[PDB]
Amino acid sequence: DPIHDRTSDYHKYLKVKQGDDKRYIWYNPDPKERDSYECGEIVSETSDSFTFKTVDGQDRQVKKDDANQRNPIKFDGVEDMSELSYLNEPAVFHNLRVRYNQDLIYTYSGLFLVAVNPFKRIPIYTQEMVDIFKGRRRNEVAPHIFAISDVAYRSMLDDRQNQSLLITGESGAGKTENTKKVIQYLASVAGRGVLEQQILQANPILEAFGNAKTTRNNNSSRFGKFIEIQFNSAGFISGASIQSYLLEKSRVVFQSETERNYHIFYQLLAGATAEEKKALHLAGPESFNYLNQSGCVDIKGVSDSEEFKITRQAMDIVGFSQEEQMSIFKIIAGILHLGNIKFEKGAGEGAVLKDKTALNAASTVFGVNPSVLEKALMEPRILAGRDLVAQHLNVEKSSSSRDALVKALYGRLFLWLVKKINNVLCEERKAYFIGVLDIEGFEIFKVNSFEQLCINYTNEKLQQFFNHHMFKLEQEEYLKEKINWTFIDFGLDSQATIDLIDGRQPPGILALLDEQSVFPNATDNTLITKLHSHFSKKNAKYEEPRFSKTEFGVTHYAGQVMYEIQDWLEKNKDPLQQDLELCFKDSSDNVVTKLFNDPNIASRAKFITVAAQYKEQLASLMATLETTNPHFVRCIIPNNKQLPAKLEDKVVLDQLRCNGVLEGIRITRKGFPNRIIYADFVKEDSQKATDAVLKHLDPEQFRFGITKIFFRAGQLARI
Ligand SMILES: Nc1ncnc2c1ncn2[C@@H]1O[C@H](COP(=O)(O)OP(=O)(O)O)[C@@H](O)[C@H]1O
Ligand code: BEF
Ligand SMILES: [Mg+2]
Numbered sequence: 001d002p003i004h005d006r007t008s009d010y011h012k013y014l015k016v017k018q019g020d021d022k023r024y025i026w027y028n029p030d031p032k033e034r035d036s037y038e039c040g041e042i043v044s045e046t047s048d049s050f051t052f053k054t055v056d057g058q059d060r061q062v063k064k065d066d067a068n069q070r071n072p073i074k075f076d077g078v079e080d081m082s083e084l085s086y087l088n089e090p091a092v093f094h095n096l097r098v099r100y101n102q103d104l105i106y107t108y109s110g111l112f113l114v115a116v117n118p119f120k121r122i123p124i125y126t127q128e129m130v131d132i133f134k135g136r137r138r139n140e141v142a143p144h145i146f147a148i149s150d151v152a153y154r155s156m157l158d159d160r161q162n163q164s165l166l167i168t169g170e171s172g173a174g175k176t177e178n179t180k181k182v183i184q185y186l187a188s189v190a191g192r193g194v195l196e197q198q199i200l201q202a203n204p205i206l207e208a209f210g211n212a213k214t215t216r217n218n219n220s221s222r223f224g225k226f227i228e229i230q231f232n233s234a235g236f237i238s239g240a241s242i243q244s245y246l247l248e249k250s251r252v253v254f255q256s257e258t259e260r261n262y263h264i265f266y267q268l269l270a271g272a273t274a275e276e277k278k279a280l281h282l283a284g285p286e287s288f289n290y291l292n293q294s295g296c297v298d299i300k301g302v303s304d305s306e307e308f309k310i311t312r313q314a315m316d317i318v319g320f321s322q323e324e325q326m327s328i329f330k331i332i333a334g335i336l337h338l339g340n341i342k343f344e345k346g347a348g349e350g351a352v353l354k355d356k357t358a359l360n361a362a363s364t365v366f367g368v369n370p371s372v373l374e375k376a377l378m379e380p381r382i383l384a385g386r387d388l389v390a391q392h393l394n395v396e397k398s399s400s401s402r403d404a405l406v407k408a409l410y411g412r413l414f415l416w417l418v419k420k421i422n423n424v425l426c427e428e429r430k431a432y433f434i435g436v437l438d439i440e441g442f443e444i445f446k447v448n449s450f451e452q453l454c455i456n457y458t459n460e461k462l463q464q465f466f467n468h469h470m471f472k473l474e475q476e477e478y479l480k481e482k483i484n485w486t487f488i489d490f491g492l493d494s495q496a497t498i499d500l501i502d503g504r505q506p507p508g509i510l511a512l513l514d515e516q517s518v519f520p521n522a523t524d525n526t527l528i529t530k531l532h533s534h535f536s537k538k539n540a541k542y543e544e545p546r547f548s549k550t551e552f553g554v555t556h557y558a559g560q561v562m563y564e565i566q567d568w569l570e571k572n573k574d575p576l577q578q579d580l581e582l583c584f585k586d587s588s589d590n591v592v593t594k595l596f597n598d599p600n601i602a603s604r605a606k607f608i609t610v611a612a613q614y615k616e617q618l619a620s621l622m623a624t625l626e627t628t629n630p631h632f633v634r635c636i637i638p639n640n641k642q643l644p645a646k647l648e649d650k651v652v653l654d655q656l657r658c659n660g661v662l663e664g665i666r667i668t669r670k671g672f673p674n675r676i677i678y679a680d681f682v683k684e685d686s687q688k689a690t691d692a693v694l695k696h697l698d699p700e701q702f703r704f705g706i707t708k709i710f711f712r713a714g715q716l717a718r719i
Contacts (some may be wrong), residue, residue: 002128002132003132003136003140003141006018008130009123009124010129010132010142012120013103013123013124014104014124014142014143014192015104015142015463016077016099016102016104017233022041023041023042023044023069024039024040024041024042024048024052024069024070025040025042025052025062025068025069025070026038026039026040026068026069026070026088026090026091026094027040027052027054027060027062027068029055029056029438030657031056033650035089035604035649035650036649036650037068037090038054038055039055039307040052040054040055040060041053041071041680043059043611048063048064048572049061049062049063049064050064050067058103059220060157065321067085067092067157068088068089069085069091070086070090070091070094070673071084071085071091071095072085073619074092074471075095075158076095076098077098077099077102078095078192078699079108079142079143080106080107080109080110080139080143080222081095081107081110081114081665082108082109082110082660082665082668082673083107083696085528085714085717087666087669088443089156089519089653089656089657089664091661092109092661092662092665093649093653093656094115095107095231095634096116096652097234097645097647100116100118100638100647101647103118103122104119104142104143104458105122106142106143106144106145106567107632108412109141109634109661109664110664110665110666110668111470111631111632111636112632112633112634112661112664112665113143113145113147113148113631113632113633114290114634114636114661115145115173115174115178115633115634115635115636116174116635116638116647116652117172117173117174117177117635117638118644119635119636119642119643119644120644120645122470125146125181125184126142127188127196129146130145130146130184130185130189132146132152132243133146133147133150133185134189135148135150135154136150137151138151141479145181145182145185145633146181146185148165148182148631148633149165149182149186150185150189151180151631152165152434152629152631153186153189153190153235153434155400155629156231156235156434157220157433158680159629160432161432161628161629162432162433162434162435162437162509162627162628162629163413163433163434163435163628163629163630163631164434164435164437164624164625164628164629164630165182165434165435165436165437165475165630165631165632165633166436166437166466166625166630166631166632166633167179167182167438168371168437168439168440168441168459168462168633168635169440169441169483169634169635169636169637169655169659170216170440170441170635170637170655171214171216171217171220171440172217172220172637172642173218173441173635173636173637173655174635174636174637175241175438175439175440176207176219176221176267176438177264177633178437178633178635179225179227179436180203183199183200183203183227183229183436184200185329186229186237186434187200187237189201190231190235190236190237191236191237192236192670193237193267195239195425196237197239197317198318198319198424198425198513199229199237199240199425201314201317201318202240202242202314202318202421202425203314204310204311204314204419204508205220205311205314205315205318205416205421205491206223206225206242206244206421207221207263208262208263208267208307208311209242209262209263209264209413209414209417210222210223210247210262210266210414211262211263212219212248212251212255212259212260212261212262213228213259213260213263213296213299214256214259214641215256215258215259215582217642218299218300218301218379218642219263220300221438222247222251222262223244223245223246223247223414224244224246224437224438224439224440224455224458225243225244225245225437225438225439226240226242226243226245226435226436226437226438226439226621226624227240227241227242227243227435227436227437227438228240228241228243228433228434228435229433229434229435229436230426230427230430230433231430231431231434232430232431233353233431233435235431238427238430238431238527239425239427239428239430240425240426240715241424241425241426242320242418242421242422242425243418243617243621244414244415244418244452245439245615246451246455247410247411247414248451249407249408249410249411250407250566252290252335252406252407252410253290253339253403253406253597254293255293255294255408256294257294257295257296258294258295258296259294259296260294260296260299261290261291261294262410263286263304264299264311264332265285265291265332265336266291266298266304267280267291267304267305267307267308267311268308268333269282269283269284269285269291269304270303270305270308270331271304271305271306271307271308271309271312272308272329276329280329280330280333280365281333281337281361281364281365282333282336287340288336288339288340289339290335290338290339290340298471303520306439306524309520312325315331315654318421318424319424320420320693321434323590324591325589326418326589327589327590327592328413328417328591330365330366330367330589330591330592331365331366331409331413331589331591331592331595332360332363333365334361334362334366334409335362335406335409335410337358337359337361337362338358338362338405338406339358339402339406340357340632341353341358341359341362341377341402342354342355342358342377342445343395343399343402344395345394345395348392348512348638349394350378350379350393350394351378351392351393351394351395351397351398351399352378353374353378356370356374359373359374359637361491361557365594366584366587366589366592367587367588367589368583368584368586368587368588368592369583369586372582372586373580373583375390375579376397376577376579376580376582377393377401377405377579377580378392378393378401379391379393379425380393380396380401380577380578380579380580381507381578381579382577388704401577401580403579404575404576404580405580407577408574408576408580408615409584409595411597412596412601412602413591415601416594416595419600419601424440425429425505435624435625435628437465437621437625438631439458440455440459440659441459441658441659442455442456442459442556442557442558442561442659442706443455443456443561444522444558444559444561444658446702448562448563448564449563449564449566449567449568449571450560450563450567450568450571450572450610450611451571452561452563453501453509453554453563453588454611454614456554456556456561457498457501457502458496459556459557459558460494460501460556460557460633461498461618461622462496463557463660464490464491464493464494464495465622465625465626465630465665466630466660466664467489467490467491467493467494467660468489468491468533469630470490470588470664470668471487471488471489471490471491471659474668474671475487477675478671480706481675481706481707481708481710482704483537483672483703483705484694484703484712485671485672487670487671488501491631494557496539496540496541497541497554497555497556498545498558500539500541500542500554500616501554504530506534507534509531509535509554510611510612512527512531512534512613513527513531513568513569513572513609513611514572514609514611515530516530516568516569517572517573517609518609520571523551523569524550524566524568524569525567527569528549528550528551531552531565532544532552535552540555541554542554542555543555543560544697545562548562550564550565550566551563551564551565552565558657558658558659559649559658568676571608571610572610572611573609573610574604574610581596581602584596585597597646607623620654634659634660634661636655636656636659637651637655638652639651658702671710671712672702672703672710672711672712673711673712673713674710674715674716675705675708675709675711676708676709676711676716677707677708678690678707678708678709681693681709687704690709691704695710700712700713701715
C-alpha cells in the first residue's frame with residue numbers, strides 16, 4: 001500500500017517527506033518591487049504597527065492591517081492552503097514555492113487545484129500512480145490531477161450528476177498536459193478497448209492541426225476545446241464528444257519570428273514518402289512562403305517525421321479512410337501552394353499572375369479548375385447595384401483574397417476533422433458525462449484584438465460562474481445549519497463588464513460591431529467612433545484613450561485591457577468571395593466538396609456574424625456547465641523562459657491575482673470559515689459539551705449551528 005509505505009514512489013514524488021516561539025513577517029527590501037520579499041522577525045509593537053528586524057539587521061515599522069504575517073513554519077508545504085492562518089500574497093506564494101522546491105507541483109487552495117508547470121518530467125503519471133488514486137477522497141491522498149479526476153468520477157456515480165473540470169491559465173502553463181492526464185485517468189478507471197483507444201487518439205489528431213510552436217509554448221493550443229467524456233449508467237466509458245473554439249486561422253498565413261505554423265505542415269513535408277512528395281508537388285519548408293518567413297522550421301526535441309507517423313497512426317485508429325487521409329494531405333499541400341502564388345502589378349491597378357506553377361499545383365491537388373480559380377482570385381464578380389460585375393483586384397486585394405481562401409480552407413478542414421471524430425466517438429444516448437474545458441485564461445497582451453476580447457468575454461463568464469458557485473455553496477451550508485450571514489453573490493459584480501460586451505439594450509460592443517458590420521458605409525474609424533459615442537464617460541467599465549484614435553479600454557475582472565480596432569469589421573464578417581466558394585464547390589475531391597457544400601461546415605448558420613456565433617456558442621457552453629458539478633484547476637507558469645527550478649515571484653504573483661485564487665481563497669474568511677461537527681470537536685450532548693470546552697477559555701468568535709460549531713478566521717487555529 002504505497003500510501004502507507006514511506007519508501008514508495010508515491011511518498012517520494014507526491015508528499016513532503018516524513019521522518020521518525022517568536023513572530024515573523026514577509027516584507028519588501030525595496031518598496032518599488034512589491035513581489036520580492038524577505039523574512040523579517042517582529043521585535044516589538046505599538047497597537048497599530050509592528051517593528052521588525054530586516055535581513056540587513058535594521059529596524060522598520062508597518063501598520064497591522066498592512067502586515068504580511070508569515071505562517072508558522074510547520075505549515076510550510078501544507079497540501080491545502082485553506083489550512084493557512086495567513087493568506088496574504090507572500091504567504092500563498094511561499095507555500096507554493098516550498099512545495100515546488102520539492103517538485104510538488106500540485107496544491108489545493110479551497111476548491112481549486114493549483115498546478116505549477118515543472119518544465120521537466122516528474123514520474124507521477126504511470127499506471128501505478130493511477131491505481132493509487134482509485135476511490136480515494138481528496139483528503140486521503142496527495143494533491144494531483146488524478147485525485148480531482150477521481151473525485152469527479154465518484155461524484156458522478158454517487159450523485160448521478162454530470163461533472164465538469166475547468167482547466168485554465170496562460171499559454172505554456174500546463175492546461176493541455178493536465179487535460180490529457182484527466183482523459184488518461186478516466187480511460188483507465190472507467191475503461192474496458194477500441195473505444196478508449198479511439199478517444200485517446202483523437203488528441204494527436206487535433207494537436208497536429210490545431211497546435212503550433214509559439215514563443216510561449218513549443219506545443220501551444222491555437223484553439224480552445226471542451227471534451228465530453230460520456231459514461232453509461234454503470235459508469236463505463238460509452239463515448240466522447242469534442243467542441244472546438246476560436247481556431248487561430250491567421251497562423252496559416254503569417255507567423256511571428258521564431259514561431260511555427262501548425263505542426264501538420266512540418267509533419268507532412270518531413271514524413272511524406274517519395275510517392276506522396278512528388279504526387280503533392282512537395283518540397284522542403286524553405287520553399288514555401290507560409291513556412292519560410294519566421295526563421296524556424298524545427299522544434300528542439302521534436303522529430304516531425306516521427307510525429308507524422310504518430311498522426312497517421314491516430315488517423316487509422318479513429319477510422320479515417322486512406323482516401324480521406326490522402327485528401328486531408330492534399331488540402332494541406334494545396335494551401336502551401338496557394339501561399340506561393342505571386343501576384344504582381346499589371347498595366348493598370350489590376351494584379352496579374354505571370355507564372356502559373358503554384359496556381360496549377362494548388363489546383364491539381366485541390367481538384368479545381370485553375371482558370372476558374374485564377375479568375376476567382378483576381379477577377380471576382382461582385383454585386384454592384386443590380387449588375388454582377390467582375391472586378392479586377394490589385395496586388396494587395398488579390399493577396400488578401402487568396403489568404404482568405406487559405407484560412408477558410410484550414411478552418412473548414414479543422415471543423416470537418418472534429419465532426420468526423422465526433423461521428424465515431426459520440427454515444428448516442430449517454431447516461432452521464434464528465435466534461436473537460438481546456439481554454440486560455442484572461443489574455444492581456446501588448447496588443448489585444450477581437451480574438452482577445454472574445455476570450456476575455458469567455459473568462460468573465462467563467463469567473464462569474466466560479467463566484468456564483470461559491471455563493472451557492474456557502475448559502476446552502478449557512479442556511480442548512482441556520483446561521484445569520486447576509487452575503488452578497490460576488491457573481492453580480494461581473495455583470496456590468498459582461499453587459500458592456502454582450503448586452504442588447506442598451507447595445508454593448510458586440511451589438512454595435514454587428515450593427516456596423518451588416519450595413520454599408522462602415523470603417524474601423526466609424527466603428528471606434530460609435531463605441532466611444534455609446535460608452536466614453538457613459539459606461540463605468542469603458543475608457544476612451546487620451547490619445548489613441550484606434551483603441552478602447554475595458555475594465556475586466558483581471559484588470560483593464562486595451563483593444564485595438566483594426567480589421568474588426570472584416571473579422572466579424574469573415575468574408576470569402578462567392579466566386580471562390582463557387583470555384584471549390586465544383587472540386588473533384590471528396591473532402592474538399594464537403595467543406596464547401598455542407599452548410600454545417602461552409603456557413604455559420606442563418607447570416608450570423610462571427611461575434612454572434614461566438615456569443616451563442618459561449619451561452620451553450622455555459623448552459624451545459626450550469627447543469628454540472630464543477631471542479632476548478634488553475635495552471636500556473638513558473639517563469640517566461642520555459643525553465644525548470646525557477647519559480648519567479650513576479651511572474652507567479654501576477655497569475656494569482658488575475659486567475660481568482662487570491663481573491664477566492666479569502667472570500668470564505670469572511671464569516672465563519674471553519675465548521676466542525678460537535679462530536680468530532682469534543683474528541684452525551686455534543687452541543688453543550690462544546691459550549692463548555694469553549695467557555696473554559698470570546699463568544700463572538702463562534703456561532704453554534706444545528707450540527708456543527710462555526711468559528712471565525714483564526715479562532716480554530718488558536719484552539
Ligand atoms: N505536469 C507536467 N509535467 C511535465 N511537463 C509539463 C507538465 N505540464 C506542462 N508541461 C510542459 O510544458 C509544456 C506546455 O504545457 P501545455 O499543457 O501545452 O500548456 P497550455 O496547454 O497551458 O498552453 C509542455 O509541452 C511540457 O513541456
Ligand atoms: F499554449 Be497553451 F495551449 F495555452
Ligand atoms: Mg494547450
